[PDB]
Amino acid sequence: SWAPSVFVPLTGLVLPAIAMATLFVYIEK
Amino acid sequence: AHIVKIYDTCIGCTQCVRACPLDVLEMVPWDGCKASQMASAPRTEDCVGCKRCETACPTDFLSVRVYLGSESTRSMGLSY
Amino acid sequence: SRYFDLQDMENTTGSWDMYGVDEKKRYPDNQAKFFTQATDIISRRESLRALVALSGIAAIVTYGLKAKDADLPITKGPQTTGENGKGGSV
Amino acid sequence: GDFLVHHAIALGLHTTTLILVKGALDARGSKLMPDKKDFGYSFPCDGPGRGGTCDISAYDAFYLAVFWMLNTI
Amino acid sequence: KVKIAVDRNPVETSFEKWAKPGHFSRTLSKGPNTTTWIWNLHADAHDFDSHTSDLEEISRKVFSAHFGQLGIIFIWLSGMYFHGARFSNYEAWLSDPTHIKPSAQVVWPIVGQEILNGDVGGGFQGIQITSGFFQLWRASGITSELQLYTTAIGGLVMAAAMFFAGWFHYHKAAPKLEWFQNVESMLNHHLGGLLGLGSLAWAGHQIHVSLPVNKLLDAGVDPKEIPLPHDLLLNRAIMADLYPSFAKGIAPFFTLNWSEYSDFLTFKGGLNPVTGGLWLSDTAHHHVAIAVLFLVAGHMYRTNWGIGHSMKEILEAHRGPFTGEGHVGLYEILTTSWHAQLAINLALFGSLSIIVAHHMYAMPPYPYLATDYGTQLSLFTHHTWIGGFCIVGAGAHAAIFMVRDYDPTNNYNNLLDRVIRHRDAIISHLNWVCIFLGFHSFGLYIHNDTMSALGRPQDMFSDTAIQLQPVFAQWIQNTHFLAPQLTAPNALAATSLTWGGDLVAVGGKVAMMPISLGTSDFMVHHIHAFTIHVTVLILLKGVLFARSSRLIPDKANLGFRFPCDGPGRGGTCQVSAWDHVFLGLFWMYNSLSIVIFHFSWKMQSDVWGTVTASGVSHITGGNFAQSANTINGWLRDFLWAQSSQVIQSYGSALSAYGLIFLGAHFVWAFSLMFLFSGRGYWQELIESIVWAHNKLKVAPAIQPRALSITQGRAVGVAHYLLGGIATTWSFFLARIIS
Amino acid sequence: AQVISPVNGDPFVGMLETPVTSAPIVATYLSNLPAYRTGVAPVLRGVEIGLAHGFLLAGPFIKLGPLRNVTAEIAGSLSAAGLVLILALCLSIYGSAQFQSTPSIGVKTLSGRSVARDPLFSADGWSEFAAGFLVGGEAGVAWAYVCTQI
Amino acid sequence: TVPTLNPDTPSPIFGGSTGGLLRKAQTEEFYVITWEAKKEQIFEMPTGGAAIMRQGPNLLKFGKKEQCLALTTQLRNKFKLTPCFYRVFPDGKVQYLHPADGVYPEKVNAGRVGANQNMRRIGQNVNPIKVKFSGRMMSPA
Amino acid sequence: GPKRGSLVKILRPESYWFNQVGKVVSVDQSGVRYPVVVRFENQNYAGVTTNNYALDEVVAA
Amino acid sequence: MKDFTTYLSTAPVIATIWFTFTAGLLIEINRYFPDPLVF
């Protein structure tokens, strides 16, 4: 419960959140 | 835009110019054929690539060819 | 009665602002000052990708890590003894 | 029961290879389209004229071949 | 001056054109070079508009074509009667309805097919029918086979007469354009003669034949012992004895003492408790009223005397602010285009056949109908289908009008113009509403599946956990059962038990009972409404932009039926109106398929079953309300569980349904080859095969060609529908019969 | 007299001026809203729009949620504060791509005279909106659970 | 011979449709068509709708050149008339298009040299190994 | 060129009638490249029964 | 009747007058010789 409480929601949201953000800017600009 | 070429097997029956929806082709004088005329593609930036021109050609094999190439706002039929 | 003018290059195509009235501020003297000063430091666009992203992760990593039955049924965990499998397993 | 199913699988093999081989050998040229090699491996068609030319490219041949892969295995 | 106008002997009647296939078009008449010829000549066989520009010749063709159709249909009706007379159990069935299965087909003894002759009762071995003829026959008062024979021979004569009629009205005396355009007269005569005198004379049959014979049968007296229906006419002593008001003859009719006819002309409603069908007396009075209504209605329009309305006048009158000129120009259109009329008529027929299914679902009008579950499921599914198809057809032809007949210069119309000018808003809004509906219907089922999988039943959309009650529907049901007391006093019971109470049962089976409506029903209806809206999206988009769009402005010149306009403009696959009809057929199939599944599960779970000690055991034990809320529930509780009887139908009378079960999957899957592929591959394949032929000097003169793109699509959709429908067909019938 | 007519005279522009679209009213209400105002600086618009959605998102996550059957409004509170901060990413990232050089709007009014162009569409424009959507959203969320809870 | 002047003339009668102009006409290139209709007779709007033509000079507004050459071929075939048509840009410039050299492209006019005209049979093209290591295609040799 | 109505094999590989037979309609006596106008019994895909060929793309057999 | 016979000698008519023949033949032979898995 120590590790997977942190790494699951970061891989679930925070990796795709900034990936969809920084890849969007790569496409359009 | 799309590439459109006319080869020397053209008879100059003019069907491919008369068929086009976007006026890409025209007829020019020549010395090769019984009709004394050949087809030409000076306006390919307006070419959409719908291939009516090809469908209209009587020669065997076709003496117009449309090679679908790099696509621009006009070639993609956009009104928006 | 002619909509065809090269000199009038904006009226032609129909780029008319449909409901874009050019009226004065109906917004109050005291209140417009409350919410200019309050929303002027967060204004800049570069600061949002630094604040909203990192402080937003600090919002997930706070209310995300904070682990009992009280709020969700997984950090609760298994509260009964293991069930028997199909191939006589634990 | 073993007998029938192996011949079903043989059907699987030979037909998928029919699509793939046909697609490979007619990648360059055919009677419908002698200049296919000028266009390359994937193209939508060559228009509606002279009958219609949907799924003419070797690309599309492989595409069709995948369905038999799937069915056979 | 509406009058009889005819051309004398316009076409000679020798076989000179039989022997010339494709005579009808200058193109095909030249003969075949390629195999494509063969297809084309069948494709355009009935397409008269492309043959000729003359509206006269087309008009002559169309109904003679209709006389031919009617001939065929008579011959079909002849068929059923004869078999019902010759190869059936009906007399056995006219003596113990409860314990005989209706059968009117026998197999010949060869090739093991003998097993199909199943144990159907009355000492007869055969195929159990689900057409519902046996009940028609009881309703019509038919008692013996001889009668069925005589009806059959009459239908054959009528077939001959219709065929004669069709040759005649093309080859000897073909009516003039003027003729066909007498719309007011046509409408009046069809309303008053056909419908009016039809239901009037029928009501004659019902009052003189149906009602008496039915009471004696329901009394229980042996049918052989029952008096013959002509002796009911000449001996009214038997009619007086059965209903007293006959003693006074037709006197109460003329004297307006109609209340004395309350013996056989009732308004009771509900079901006949001894038979599980509507009162014949209610039906007799129904048809009597309806006849009068239609008869007076058929005297609306102006003909050969001043009196009467003119269609064009009423149309030109009806205009307002938002629409501009309104209905103006429509008469002229609808008197010069068969397509437009076809479009209208198909929409409303189709709608009619579906309402017929429901109203036959809720109010079983025939004896021992309700309790023959096979018949009831068959009839409702059937009629729901044909409606389905007809509605899509309406869309198809609407578009065909839109491309071929529309000409603003010659035949202007503004309603149409205004519709055309804002089509974008209509289609965009339909798009929106459809995504809405899709999410808030399917999404609910996916949500349920997820919550159910994640162990959270209290969070589901269901009567137990989530409540989505059909409050309106429940209100209307409330109003319907209380109506006989307040708003319809003279009516004894309710129209239907699925609104009221009073569970009526026959032979230990449930005829009808109150239908409970919960969350599951909320779900499926909104799925329907979604499906209908999508189908409408496709078809309306098809018809409105048939002529032009932003991509292809000159689509109108290209035709109704055509594949594409190349890979240009990014690619223009399936631009034509035909392609819209194409895709419309799939969504229609989808929609209709959930309806009949809805029907079948609904009926077996919440309605049908056996009746025990003061209680009811339903066929599937009321699982619906709890199971139909998840996709998994359909997958398992409906599909998987119910397919049981079809999957083990082998070695029985029902084995043909297992064979057809597999065969229909085959043909469905077989369609996918055509749907997923394109003729480019096929033509090259054909090049290699042709090589092989030529190598052995066995090449055909008719040059072998792959199907057109359009034909590929048509074959695809056709096999897709046939496969799907036939599979559901084998499913239900084996299921419900066993 | 026709209720429906061509767009400001021009009949060859993709639209139809119905009494739904153009009228004595509707042209006065839509201009009263924050976004459509032309003369105001780009700070105060975003707050008036941003705040509002903080209350439209607030009601929802209380009564339908997993802890609806219990922390029910604490649960619904910061979840409305979230679609705010993501919109801020969406609107800051929307802005990151578009504006490289100068604005682009229908410059004139219905009267047709060349009015000054709005800062609604510019490099320094959508920034103060994206800021307005944040400070409005986050604060505006707090007042649907200082009034329903505290 | 001279290409057409670009004056202000009144467009023909039309209640208006949704098929017409959009954002593309404002920030990209829209299109203008010119002709002298003799009488007032109705025509099919290529972007949907019924519309009455007026006598004398008539101009229309479209955002794609197909919408011109669908109409022009509908004006040229049906009514037997002869329209000119050209582009527009959003800074106020024009591009004269059709007929480019007064003569329509189907019948021959001197002073229109041949472009993209390959002078061999198509099967006399080289194989696409002989056009790698470049940015070239298979036909231009 | 070939004599009118003579049976001629096509030798242009990109033709629909390649290695197939046709009849000569008329060989144009001019400076044209494809003078030999041939007509065939069987059409191609493009609904055409006739084409033009050069003197090295025919062989009378 | 030169014309009527040409129609009777049309493809779809011949096919049907041929198939009812080679169908009957196979139904017929399955009657008097029922249920074959040899010969």
Ligand SMILES: CC1=C(C/C=C(\C)CCC[C@H](C)CCC[C@H](C)CCCC(C)C)C(=O)c2ccccc2C1=O
């Ligand atoms: C297989 C296939 C073909 C080729 C298939 C063909 C041509 C079907 C027609 C074959 C039948 C068997 C020909 C009919 C022959 C006559 C009935 C005469 C036969 C003689 C006796 C045995 C009766 C296509 O043409 C096609 C087109 C577009 C998309 C997909 C496909 C596709 O999948």
Ligand code: SF4
């Ligand atoms: S069609 Fe083929 S032949 Fe007729 S002109 Fe265009 S090119 Fe020359």
Ligand code: SF4
């Ligand atoms: S249909 Fe076949 S040909 Fe016409 S476009 Fe789509 S793919 Fe290319």
